[PDB]
Every structure is written in structure tokens, then in C-alpha cells.
Amino acid sequence: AFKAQAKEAQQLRERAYLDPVSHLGNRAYYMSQLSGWLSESGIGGVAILQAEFIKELYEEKGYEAGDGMVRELADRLKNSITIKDISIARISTYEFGIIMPNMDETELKIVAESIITCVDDINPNLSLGVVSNKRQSSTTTLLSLLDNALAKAKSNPELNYGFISSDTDKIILGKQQWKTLVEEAIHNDWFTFRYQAANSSWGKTFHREVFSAFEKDGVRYTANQFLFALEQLNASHIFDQYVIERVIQQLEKGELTDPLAINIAQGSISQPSFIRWISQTLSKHLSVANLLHFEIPEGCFVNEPHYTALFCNAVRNAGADFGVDNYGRNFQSLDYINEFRPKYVKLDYLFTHHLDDERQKFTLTSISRTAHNLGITTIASRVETQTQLDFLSEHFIEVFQGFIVD
Amino acid sequence: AFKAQAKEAQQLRERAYLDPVSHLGNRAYYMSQLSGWLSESGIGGVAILQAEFIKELYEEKGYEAGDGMVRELADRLKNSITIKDISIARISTYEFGIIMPNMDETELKIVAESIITCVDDINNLSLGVVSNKRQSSTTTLLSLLDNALAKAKSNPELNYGFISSDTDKIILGKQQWKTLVEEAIHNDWFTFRYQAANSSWGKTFHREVFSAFEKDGVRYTANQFLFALEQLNASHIFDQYVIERVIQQLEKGELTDPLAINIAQGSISQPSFIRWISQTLSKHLSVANLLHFEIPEGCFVNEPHYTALFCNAVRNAGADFGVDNYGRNFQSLDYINEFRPKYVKLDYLFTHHLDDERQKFTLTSISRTAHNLGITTIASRVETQTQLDFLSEHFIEVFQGFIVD
Ligand SMILES: Nc1nc2c(ncn2[C@@H]2O[C@@H]3COP(=O)(O)O[C@H]4[C@@H](O)[C@H](n5cnc6c(=O)[nH]c(N)nc65)O[C@@H]4COP(=O)(O)O[C@H]3[C@H]2O)c(=O)[nH]1
Ligand SMILES: Nc1nc2c(ncn2[C@@H]2O[C@@H]3COP(=O)(O)O[C@H]4[C@@H](O)[C@H](n5cnc6c(=O)[nH]c(N)nc65)O[C@@H]4COP(=O)(O)O[C@H]3[C@H]2O)c(=O)[nH]1
Ligand SMILES: Nc1nc2c(ncn2[C@@H]2O[C@@H]3COP(=O)(O)O[C@H]4[C@@H](O)[C@H](n5cnc6c(=O)[nH]c(N)nc65)O[C@@H]4COP(=O)(O)O[C@H]3[C@H]2O)c(=O)[nH]1
Ligand SMILES: Nc1nc2c(ncn2[C@@H]2O[C@@H]3COP(=O)(O)O[C@H]4[C@@H](O)[C@H](n5cnc6c(=O)[nH]c(N)nc65)O[C@@H]4COP(=O)(O)O[C@H]3[C@H]2O)c(=O)[nH]1
Ligand SMILES: [Mg+2]
Ligand SMILES: [Mg+2]
């Protein structure tokens, strides 16, 4: 009976705390290791890694290939980066949790730097959020910090990882807390709007892109702080419908003479009620329909082409038009332009970031010709310096947008 | 050390085999009890209960109400059934697994009858039960359990779907069914029947299309595999094939009357299918007037936004649509006013299984609503003149079934 109990104990232990796919700790293992680390010392850092490319693999090539990639990333992650008291677990379907005790901020960065380099050799599309615990924090607090840091990494892909320290003065909220605050901001009309003009070299204004923000108790919140929570909760269409209503009100006032570019989140386009909503509202404001440009992220066209085409049809049937926002980020998978024929393409802002890389300049010219050959206006994005402005000039970009154009 | 070892083992067992929401065994616990029961005896029955209304609750009222309903049904299940060695587990998000050892068929049926009446007290579900009469593996029983559940859904007049383990019917897993359908599509193994829906004076309103296929002498009807196609998000592939084959028949200028094509619910919630129907109809505008798309009532009440996009695309191209299983959700029947379907095909539960009086009033009311809105009412699956005369007493316009054609 000894052999029964001893081996039954290990199988029960692995059933309770081990995820069969990744062969790492499961979510319950992670919370146990997290709660014990906090109650004893709480000195160290915590990190979360999301493998969105594994999510894209699951429906594309089935789950046999998806499970194999989870195991591969798990095997590659765990055999590398071995330190004392290191907890590595699979806390959800597409994200991994990591606990690094007895490490200060600089030590976590080298571990986080080693994580990312550990995922470049193994598939060649991920996001890494890391937080350092420098105050006494509860377990829900660190998970909220971990989630907001992950949103920071996604919203700024030029960062290798998103870093937030537990002592930060920044407002950190959970997903449902962000949604409640946005609903509060929508209800009380706390929103403010900015209009950035996209101008040609001749001063002709193509359109003015609308940026949404809101303020509560003297604190200002921008869209990249809460948009991850709304899309994860399938509530971003509430936010987009409010912005579209407010923008159309301004056009109905006969004030703005030029077209306005409204950003649309991906989670809103995959909502069929939002696709019906656009047709119903655009038909009630046909006079201003020609002055509305809907800015659709490139991720929509390549990941949700059918939802996007339904949205694009509704937009154009009502006398409006649309463009692409992160144009060029998904290079070698950018043939959707030929099918969709957008009115414009707004370049990925990472093109103004790495001018010196010769391979970056080759991709930039190639996607520039493709749009113009089809008669599609190209727009450079987030241009800050005359150096960026002059370097983008060699790629025959028609109109420019950013702080240097004012 | 003895009491300590028992606590460590019990807590380890609790983390491994307890579902925190339902406070029942989880899936791993159920597979363990099933694999042990099979390897020990294998005598008895096995059952699956799917609470589709709980899936409606999670999006409707959040997860706090969804967790509470799972616990309520879980407490209801364990306290009501009072027999030995009964495993009650939550094997998936919205379905419960039950093992009933040492029971013959009549005992399984009274236990299955006790389950459903146990869920009528507190609150839309399906119960599938199989009796083990063979030496069967675990995957076999799960496949039988899934096909029995599909039998219960495709025949809602049954309280539960019953399959014997020794049945001659072809029992396949979800991916196996999907493989067989794709094989039939590739080789054009499909056959079609056209059943006419006629008015009281013989005018044919349309002809509904029924799809089936044969593989080396075995015939398969749609209700055997459609459940596996709607799961795995693959039913639109089958519907597109049927639509393609029907349009080829209409192009030949033979059929003077419209054809009613059934569309699965999982196909309309696929946006690629909504795009496909517009492109296909735009290439065959001449025959679009001869196309009626029969949409299940569950689409209009559970997936109204997808259905509105599909209905608009269908009518924009010169086709039309109607409602299938009309009256099954009598308590949510204002979609008719918004959608204005060309016809409503009554739930076949109104022709058969309809002498309890409360159901006879619902038939009259939903018939008035359709006629007042100028919508054609069609009785379904009419077999006898007795039914035919009785449906006329509810002023039904046109009739369909074996007795008319
Ligand atoms: N029965 C049931 N209870 C639920 C469910 N969702 C949340 N609860 C609870 O709601 C609290 C707030 O969750 P959140 O708004 O999504 O805000 C979350 C979320 O922003 C983040 N977070 C937690 N887990 C994860 C994760 O696995 N991945 C990512 N990226 N963020 C997470 O930390 C914050 C708080 O985490 P929690 O401590 O777990 O605190 C959560 C959780 O205890 C559910 O689906 N079913
Ligand atoms: N270093 C530098 N930065 C510049 C420059 N020009 C603009 N930025 C800012 O970069 C973002 C450009 O908008 P986005 O890339 O489409 O990315 C947007 C956009 O995806 C989203 N967003 C903003 N407003 C909305 C909205 O109203 N609706 C939706 N669905 N998303 C919005 O949040 C993101 C951030 O918007 P903002 O915080 O206001 O930040 C804006 C803009 O203020 C520049 O020249 N140099
Ligand atoms: N690693 C991995 N493997 C997967 C996954 N999905 C399916 N499989 C594998 O493929 C086999 C076929 O499952 P199925 O085709 O959907 O066909 C299923 C299905 O028709 C039926 N059925 C099975 N489980 C359930 C269930 O939990 N609920 C309901 N309603 N029906 C079930 O039993 C058949 C499968 O028996 P299984 O022993 O479970 O054997 C499964 C399982 O080993 C997955 O997501 N990840
Ligand atoms: N006792 C009796 N039975 C009758 C009578 N008339 C028809 N039945 C049959 O009942 C079903 C009526 O079709 P349904 O209610 O829409 O229910 C259909 C329908 O929902 C689906 N189905 C059949 N063909 C197709 C198809 O081509 N595409 C899709 N998406 N579903 C189909 O499978 C289900 C079963 O169709 P079938 O097995 O061929 O069985 C058909 C029909 O042959 C009658 O007078 N008396
Ligand atoms: Mg933009
Ligand atoms: Mg039908």
C-alpha cells in the first residue's frame, strides 16, 4: 500500500498543480507560489508573458500544432533562465506567469531581457509585462499591476517589455474597474478630444485624426490606459459608439470643414451589433457622412477580414470611407489592400523609429509603392523631428502627421 | 502522522477533483470514475445533462449569476438523486456527467425522468443517456453520450435522448462526423428531397430541401451530424455546398416554385458565411426570387444581430427568408415585428404532441400575430387528415408533410 500512496500522491499533486500541455505549473500552482512569496518576504519581481502567436496558431493549424508550440515555448522558457525560487506557471490559455524573488529592478530587467531573446530563436509576436514589488501589496494588486504592465507593453511595441514598479503613482486598475470608470466618464461627459491634422507637403489637410481622453478628479486618462480592458470585456464598442456620436455632433454643428479620422478598436468591429449600429446611425447623418474617415487597425484586416469587410461595406454604403492605422506592421501578410482598397494607409509609427536599419527602409519603400500604385494615399505617422520628416521624404509619402507638423 | 497524511491526501484530492463553482467533481474526477467503473464492471448506464440556459445566463447577468446557477443546479442534482455509487460531476462548462452503475434500462429511464423533473422545480436543457451493453472504452461512451445529447436536441418532444451501446446506428465523435461530411462533399455523395408546402386549394408555396448522403450503403441524415458541424464552427461549409447545389438546379429553369433552404444556426453566426451569401447571390440574381432561406427561430432570439446581417444580405439580393420552428420560444416572439419574415413554419410540436390545452392556446395566438402582420403560416410535418383538419381550425394557410407530399 506504500507504493500506491507514494505514487498516487505525486499523480494527485501533478493533477492539481501541473498543466498537462505546458508541463509547467497551472494557475492554482501560481497563486500558491505567489501567496507564499508575498507573506514571507515580498522582495522581488513578477512577470507575465503572453504568446498571441500561439493563439493565432490554434485555429490556423489546429490544436495539435498549438499544444506543441505551448510545450516548446514552455520547454524553451523553463530550461533557460534558471534562478533560485523561480516560479514559472501557465496562468491562462495564452499567458505565462513568472515569480522572481530576491531580485531588484535591474536584475528583473536582465531576466526579462533574457526571456524575450529566448523566444526569438524558438519561433522565428508576443508581449511581456514585468513589475517589481517595492511595497507591501496584496495578490489582486500585483495581478492588476501585471495586467496594466502587459497593456503598456502591447500599446508600445517599441519597448521590449512593459515595466511598472509597485510604488508607482500611476493609477492601476483591474479590467472591470477600468470599464466602470469609462462608463462613468461616458455618463458624466468627462471626455476631451484632440484633433491632429494630416497635411501634405503643400499644406493641404487630408483629415484630422480624433484622439479621445477623459479626466476624473484632475487626473487625465488616455486611450491606451483602458482600451485593453474594454476589448477583453467585449465593451469597446460602447466606447467607440460614444466617440462616433460626439464627433458627428461636432460635424452637425457645421464647424469642422475637413474630414475627421475616428479610430475604431478591433473588438468593436467583431461585434455584429456595432456593425448594425454604424449603418443605422450613418443613415441618420448623411449630410456629414462624406466627412468621416474610419481608422481601422491593420490587425483587423489580417485577423478578422470578414467582420472588417462587413464593417467596411456598411461604412461605404452610407457615404463614408475607411483607412488602415498600423499599416506595415504585418509585413509579408499585407495583400488585404488589394481586396479592400482603403482610402488611405497610415504607416506604422515604428517606421519613424528605426531609420538607420537598411532592411527597414526596404520594407518601407515596398509598401509605399503598393499603396500609391493602387491610388491609395499614404500617411506617415507620429513624425517628431525634421530628421524623421526628411528621411520619410525619400519614400514619396504624400501626407504627414505628428508633432513636427503641429 | 496518520491524520496528517489523510489531510494532505484529501486536500490534494480536493484540489485535483473538486470544481469550486459547482462544488461537484470536475472533469478529471468524472473521467476517473468512468474509467474505473468501466475497468471494474461496466454494468449500468451513463448520462450527460447540458444546461444551455446557463450559457444564456453568463452573458446576460454576468458571471456571479452564472456561477450561482451552476451551484444551484449542482446542489439540486446531488440531493435529489439518492442511489449508490452515483458520480455527479461537471465535465464541461455547461454540461454535467453522471454515472449510474448496476442499472438496467428501466431504472436508467426513471433516473433520467427524475433528473428533468428535478430541474423543472427551480427554473431549456437537454439530457442524453446511454446504457452500456458492450465492452466499451471511455472515448466510446463520450461519443455515445454526445450523439445521445444530439438526439435529444434534434427531437425536443423527447424528455431525453436514449441510445443503447449496442445500437446499429453509426456513432462518431465531433471531428469524425466533420471528416465524414467533408468526404461526402468531396465525392458528391449527397442526395436531396423536395417537399412541397401547399395551401388549402393546392397552391404550392415552396419546396423545402432536405439533404442526406450515402457512404457504401449507409444513409446519413442531417440531424445525425449537424450538431458536430455547428460545434467546431464548420456548419457553414455544409450549408454553402447545399446552396451551391440548389442554385445549379435553379439555373436549369425547371423549378417554377421557390425552394426553401434550411440554414443552421452556427452558419449565420459566421461572418465569412454572411459575406459568402452576398457574393454568391450577386452572381445568380436571376434565380434569387426562387430562394427562401429557412432560419431557425433560435437565431432570431439568441443571435439577432448576426441574423439581421444575414437577412439584409439575403433580401438585398432579391431573395427572402422565413422562420423555422416557429412558436418553440413563444415567450420571445416580438422579433417577428422587427424582421417581418415572408413566412413562419410552425414548430412540428404543434401538429404532433399537441392536445394538452395550454399549448393549443399558444398556437392560436402566434397564428393571429403572423396573419395580422401579413405573414404566411405553414404547418410542419403533417401526417394525417385528423391533424390536417385540426390545423385548419387554427386558420393555418399552408401545410407541409407526408399527407400533402
Ligand atoms: N468566479 C469568477 N470570479 C472572477 C472572474 N473574473 C474575476 N473574478 C474576480 O474579479 C476580480 C477583478 O477581475 P478583473 O476585473 O478582470 O481585473 C483582473 C485582471 O485585470 C488581472 N488579472 C487577474 N488574472 C489575470 C490573468 O490571468 N491574465 C491577465 N492579463 N490579467 C489578470 O488582475 C485583476 C484582478 O485579478 P483577480 O485577483 O483574480 O480579481 C478578479 C477576480 O477575483 C470570473 O470569471 N469568474
Ligand atoms: N512620440 C510622439 N507621439 C504622438 C505623435 N502624434 C501623436 N502621438 C500620439 O500617438 C497616438 C497616435 O494615435 P494611434 O497611433 O492611432 O493610437 C491611439 C489609438 O490607437 C487609441 N486611441 C486614441 N483615441 C482613440 C479613440 O478615440 N477611439 C479608439 N477606438 N482608440 C483611440 O489610443 C492610442 C493612443 O492615442 P493617444 O494617447 O492620444 O496618442 C496618439 C497621439 O497623440 C508624435 O508626433 N510623436
Ligand atoms: N489535446 C487535445 N485533444 C482534444 C481536444 N479536443 C478533442 N480532443 C481529442 O480528440 C478526440 C476527439 O474528440 P471529439 O472529436 O470532439 O469527439 C468527442 C465528442 O464527440 C465526445 N465528447 C467528448 N467529450 C465531450 C464533452 O465533454 N461534452 C460533450 N457534449 N461531448 C463530448 O467524445 C469524443 C472524444 O472523446 P475524447 O476521449 O475526449 O478524445 C478526444 C480527445 O482525445 C483538445 O482540445 N486538446
Ligand atoms: N414523421 C414525419 N416526418 C417528416 C415529415 N415531413 C418531413 N419529415 C422530415 O422532418 C424534417 C423536416 O425538416 P426540418 O424540420 O426543418 O429539420 C431538418 C432540418 O432542420 C435538417 N436538415 C435537413 N436538411 C438540411 C439541409 O439541407 N441544411 C441544413 N442546415 N439542415 C437540414 O435536419 C433535420 C431533419 O431533416 P430530415 O431528417 O431529412 O427530416 C425532415 C423531413 O424529411 C412528415 O410528414 N411526418
Ligand atoms: Mg490611428
Ligand atoms: Mg426546415
- Identify the CATH number of the domain in which residue A93 sits: 3.30.70.270
Please, how many CA atoms are within 13 Å of residue B180, restricted to the half-sphere of its CB? 23
DSSP-based helix, strand, coil % in chain A, nearest 5: 50, 20, 30
Residue B47 backbone class (left: φ over 0; alpha: ψ -120 to 50; beta: rest) = beta
Residue B154, classified by CB atoms within 10 Å of its CB into exposed (0-12), middle (13-18) or buried (19+), is: middle
Q: Which of B381, B388, B405 to mutate to test the pocket of ligand 4 (most atoms within 8 A of CB)?
A: B381
Which residues on adjacent β-strands are paired with residue A209?
A196, A261
Of B15, B272, B274, the CB nearest to A16: B15
Residue A170, domain member (yes or no): no
- Going from the Cα of A325 to the center of ligand 5, the distance in angstroms, rounded, reads 5
Could you give the CA distance from residue A121 to residue A126 in angstroms, rounded to a whole number? Answer: 13
3-state secondary structure of A18: strand
- Alpha-helix runs per DSSP H in B190-234: 222-230
Looking at the complex, report in whole angstroms how far the Cα of residue B207 sits from the nearest Cα belonging to chain A. 31
Is residue B152 domain-shared with residue B231, that is, in the same domain? no
Could you give the CA distance from residue A282 to residue A289 in angstroms, rounded to a whole number? Answer: 7
Residue A234 backbone class (left: φ over 0; alpha: ψ -120 to 50; beta: rest) = left
Chain B residues interacting with chain A (CB cutoff of 8 angstroms): 5, 8-9, 12-13, 15-17, 28, 270-272, 274-275, 305-306, 308-309
Domain total of chain A: 2
Q: Which of B142, B154, B225 to mutate to test the pocket of ligand 3 (most atoms within 8 A of CB)?
A: B142
Task: Give the largest Cα separation in chain B, rounded.
Answer: 87
Which residues of chain A are within 8 Å of residue B16 when distances are taken between CB atoms?
A: 12, 15-16
Is residue B179 domain-shared with residue B161, that is, in the same domain? no
- Alpha-helix runs per DSSP H in A27-138: 27-40, 52-79, 105-117
**Shortest-distance Cα residue to atom 6 of ligand 3:** A63
Is residue B165 domain-shared with residue B177, that is, in the same domain? no
Is residue A204 domain-shared with residue A278, that is, in the same domain? yes
A210, A381 in Cβ contact below 8 A?
Answer: no
Q: Which of B267, B157, B245 is nearest to B194 (CA)?
A: B245
Is residue A182 domain-shared with residue A330, that is, in the same domain? yes
Is residue A150 domain-shared with residue A190, that is, in the same domain? no
- Centre a 10 Å sphere on the Cβ of residue B115 and count the other Cβ atoms it contains: 22
Cα-based distances in Å from B266 to A12, A31, A200, B49: 39, 37, 47, 21
Is residue B165 domain-shared with residue B175, that is, in the same domain? no
Which residues on adjacent β-strands are paired with residue B208?
B195, B260
Q: Which of A138, A135, A129, A137 is nearest to A98 (CA)?
A: A129
Which residues on adjacent β-strands are paired with residue B209?
B194, B261
Could you give the CA distance from residue A367 to residue A345 in angstroms, rounded to a whole number? Answer: 10
Is residue B201 domain-shared with residue B151, that is, in the same domain? no
CATH number at residue A289: 3.20.20.450
Q: Which of B76, B58, B177, B84 is nearest to B117 (CA)?
A: B76
Resolution of the determined structure in angstroms stands at: 2.6
Is residue B94 domain-shared with residue B191, that is, in the same domain? no
- Centre a 10 Å sphere on the Cβ of residue A193 and count the other Cβ atoms it contains: 14
Record: contact B305-A28, CB cut-off 8 A? no
Record: contact B305-A272, CB cut-off 8 A? yes
Q: Which of A63, A60, A64, A118 is nearest to A88 (CA)?
A: A118
Final residue of a domain: which of B151, B169, B187?
B169
Which residues on adjacent β-strands are paired with residue A199?
A205, A400
3-state secondary structure of A165: strand
The residue behind cell 448496476 is: B102
Could you give the CA distance from residue A391 to residue B25 in angstroms, rounded to a whole number? Answer: 64
User: Residue A377's domain spans which residues?
Assistant: 175-405
Query: What was the experiment behind these coordinates?
Result: X-ray
B118, B46 in Cβ contact below 8 A?
Answer: no
Is residue A15 domain-shared with residue A74, that is, in the same domain? yes
* Cβ within 8 Å of residue A4, ≥6 positions away: none
Is residue A103 domain-shared with residue A246, that is, in the same domain? no
The residue behind cell 507560489 is: A33
Could you give the CA distance from residue B189 to residue B77 in angstroms, rounded to a whole number? Answer: 44
Is residue B143 domain-shared with residue B226, that is, in the same domain? no
What CA dihedral angle connects B309, B314, B320 and B323, to 10 degrees?
Answer: -40
Cα-based distances in Å from B225 to A61, B96, B180, B213: 23, 22, 9, 11
Q: Which of A247, A262, A258, A254 is nearest to A199 (CA)?
A: A258
β-sheet with A95-101: strand ranges across? A87-89, A95-101, A44-50, A127-133, A162-165
Record: contact B275-A309, CB cut-off 8 A? yes
